[PDB]
């Protein structure tokens, strides 16, 4: 989790927020995915959120559902994802890497064994989308034993008990949820939540769910949050250019450049 600590320190000494794109590993194929992610990092991604293809992504709308399907159409397995993660980490030693998991893929071969493999390939954090703080104990204990930060969601209408729980249980960053619903660039902050998290010594906040334009990025940083995550806007650029691999990459680099720039105050 130290990579998150060091990134937020340097972003503080530069007066700017983090831009954190999301992609599903192996979309649309393994080799193109690795190339996409390098292009994201070259265009200015501060950290990564990476999805492992899951058969039933409950928290994802159609854009990221179709990403998962494309990956499965390329035969992408969790095992291949861990080989990709090792190749990304080998190229990028300081970039924080976070996984977006569903619980069955963590629980499947053993929770401890999952986090042990994450540590082996150099993953820094793991967010399990369908595990609330109320069920999190064996996941966050296994995460910490393997130096993985467990990421917790702070939802829009959280009470004080949730705020204090998420502050004490999480590491790396706090996931500031923009709204109810599922992921998507078609459906578009709360300053009070950002400030209560600081009082309780929570990990720094990143806003996600619905961020698709530079303006939304600048808004989050100004609200005092530490940065912002965009999945679907990234993914649709992939979807629209499946037949033009290098037109895809050019459009990805242009988009990420604009989103990154918006985080600079």
């Amino acid at each position: 989790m130290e990579r998150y600590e060091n990134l937020f320190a340097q972003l503080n000494d530069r007066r700017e927020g983090a831009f954190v794109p999301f992609v599903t590993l192996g979309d649309p194929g393994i080799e193109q995915s690795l190339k996409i992610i390098d292009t994201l990092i070259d265009a200015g991604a501060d950290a990564l959120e990476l999805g492992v293809p899951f058969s039933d992504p409950l928290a994802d709308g159609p854009t990221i559902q179709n990403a998962n399907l494309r990956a499965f159409a390329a035969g992408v397995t969790p095992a291949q994802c861990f080989e990709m993660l090792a190749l990304i980490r080998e190229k990028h030693p300081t970039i924080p890497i976070g996984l977006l998991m569903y619980a069955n893929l963590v629980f499947n071969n053993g929770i401890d064994a999952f986090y042990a493999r994450c540590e082996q390939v150099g993953v820094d954090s793991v967010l399990v989308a369908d595990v609330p703080v109320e069920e999190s104990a064996p996941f966050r204990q296994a995460a910490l034993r393997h130096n993985i930060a467990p990421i917790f969601i702070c939802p829009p209408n959280a009470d004080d008990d949730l705020l204090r729980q998420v502050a004490s249980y999480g590491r790396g960053y706090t996931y500031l949820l923009s709204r109810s619903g599922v992921t998507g660039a078609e459906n578009r902050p709360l300053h009070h939540l950002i400030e209560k998290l600081k009082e309780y010594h929570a990990a720094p906040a990143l806003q996600g769910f619905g961020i698709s334009s530079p303006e939304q990025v600048s808004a989050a940083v100004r609200a005092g949050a530490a940065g912002a995550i965009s999945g679907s806007a990234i993914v649709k650029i992939i979807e629209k250019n499946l037949a033009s691999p290098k037109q895809m990459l050019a459009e990805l680099r242009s988009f990420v450049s604009a989103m990154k720039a918006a985080s600079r105050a």
């Binding site: 899951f54 058969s55 039933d56 409950l58 928290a59 709308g61 559902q65 397995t77 969790p78 095992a79 569903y102 619980a103 069955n104 893929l105 629980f107 499947n108 071969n109 989308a129 369908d130 595990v131 609330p132 703080v133 109320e134 069920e135 917790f152 969601i153 702070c154 939802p155 829009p156 209408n157 949730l162 949820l177 709204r179 109810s180 619903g181 599922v182 459906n187």
Partner: protein, 395 residues
């Protein structure tokens, strides 16, 4: 924290995104409060009796057990308004929704019996109702699609995945995660995140309570065993609940065997799957070696689900209840047997329960046994599917 235990042994829990936890806690306290409320209970009883038609008959088969020492009764949930047991708990959940000030209903359905029940309760009680149903099930259970739309419900076909119940479940939950302040998610079975497995059992337990009183009156003793099909678990736990502390009574749940367990085309995760986390609960799942949720299969849309409710996984684990499977062909033979020899056209889901009871009789025909089958629905929704089969095989 919760007011009630969310687990049955290791099974159950609330594995939903953090955003949905207030909705679940809200539903739990409303249920706990309703269960202590005489006025709620009187309103629920009034709807069960005077609108849905309870108590349902307990019918003694004559013809199909002739020449054996089996006495077989059928608990006639096929006679309930709407045509299946799904109507019982829907009436109770609809009253909970009004108790919470909700005005919309979300529901999933496969056989379309829960969808029909959700639509009729919403028409009666003034809720706006939308229903997800797999596009495959739109077709093989199409009578119920018409029925839901005639009662004012919106019916949304789901074409992703298998186009069966799992994908309708997923779409329902996706919707609720963004509409829960105004919609109540009327989950259709005794599965999903707590408190649904508990609520659904309590709102279906009149099946077994009536059965117990009826059997005692007609036979002067408890049954040797009660037998129910298991799609997600609601009619079986509704039949089981009141017998759980009567340790002499066998509890037998019947999973779909589909084309045969060995083909992998089945719906029997309790006995042939392995524990996993999905649909908000820790429960036996059909899954790949990698943890991907497998597609189930059953001739019966209502059983075609790759998981099972957590109380059944628990009752199995401790040995209080036993679970078996019945193939498509066996269910079809029991369907035909009931039509021709008792004049009752059962749902293909219930036909799996009947098939196992007929096996119990036929395998050991001099064994003295008093059996009750939960006849969870009537078969009008299945006659077109059944006719196309009997014609494909030359009948």
């Amino acid at each position: 924290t919760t007011l009630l235990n969310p687990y049955f042994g290791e099974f159950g829990g609330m594995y939903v995104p953090q955003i949905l936890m207030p909705a679940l806690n809200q539903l739990e306290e409303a249920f706990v409060s309703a269960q202590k409320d005489p006025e709620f209970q009187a309103q629920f009883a009034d709807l069960l009796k005077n609108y849905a038609g309870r108590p349902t008959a307990l019918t003694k088969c004559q013809n199909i057990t002739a020449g054996t020492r089996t006495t077989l009764y059928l608990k006639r949930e096929d006679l309930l308004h709407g045509g299946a047991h799904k109507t019982n708990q829907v009436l109770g959940q609809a009253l909970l929704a009004k108790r919470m000030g909700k005005s919309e209903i979300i529901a999933e359905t496969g056989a379309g019996q829960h969808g029909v029940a959700s639509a009729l309760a919403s028409a009666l009680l003034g809720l706006k109702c939308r229903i997800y149903m797999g596009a495959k099930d739109v077709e093989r259970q199409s009578p119920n699609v018409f029925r839901m739309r005639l009662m004012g419900a919106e019916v949304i076909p789901v074409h992703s995945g298998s186009a069966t119940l799992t994908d309708a479940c997923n779409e329902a939950l996706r919707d609720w995660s963004g509409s829960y302040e105004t919609a109540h998610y009327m989950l259709g079975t005794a599965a999903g995140p707590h408190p649904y497995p508990t609520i659904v059992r309590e709102f279906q337990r009149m099946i077994g309570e009536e059965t117990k009183a009826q059997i005692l009156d007609k036979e002067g003793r408890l049954p040797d065993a009660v037998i129910a099909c298991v799609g997600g678990g609601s009619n079986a736990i509704g039949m089981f609940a009141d017998f759980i502390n009567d340790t002499s009574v066998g509890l037998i749940g019947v999973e779909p065997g589909g084309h045969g367990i060995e083909t992998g085309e089945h719906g029997a995760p309790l006995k042939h799957g392995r524990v996993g986390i999905y649909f908000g609960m820790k429960a036996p799942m059909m899954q790949t070696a990698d943890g991907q949720i497998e597609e189930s299969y059953s001739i019966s849309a209502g059983l075609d689900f790759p998981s099972v409710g957590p109380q059944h996984a628990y009752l199995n684990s401790i040995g209080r209840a036993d679970y078996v499977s019945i193939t498509d062909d066996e269910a079809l033979e029991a369907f035909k047997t009931l039509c021709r020899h008792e004049g009752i056209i059962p749902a293909l889901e219930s036909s799996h329960a009947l098939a196992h009871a007929l096996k119990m009789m036929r395998e050991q025909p001099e064994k003295e046994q008093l059996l009750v089958v939960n006849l969870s629905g009537r078969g009008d929704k299945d006659i077109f599917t059944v006719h196309d089969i009997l014609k494909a095989r030359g009948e």
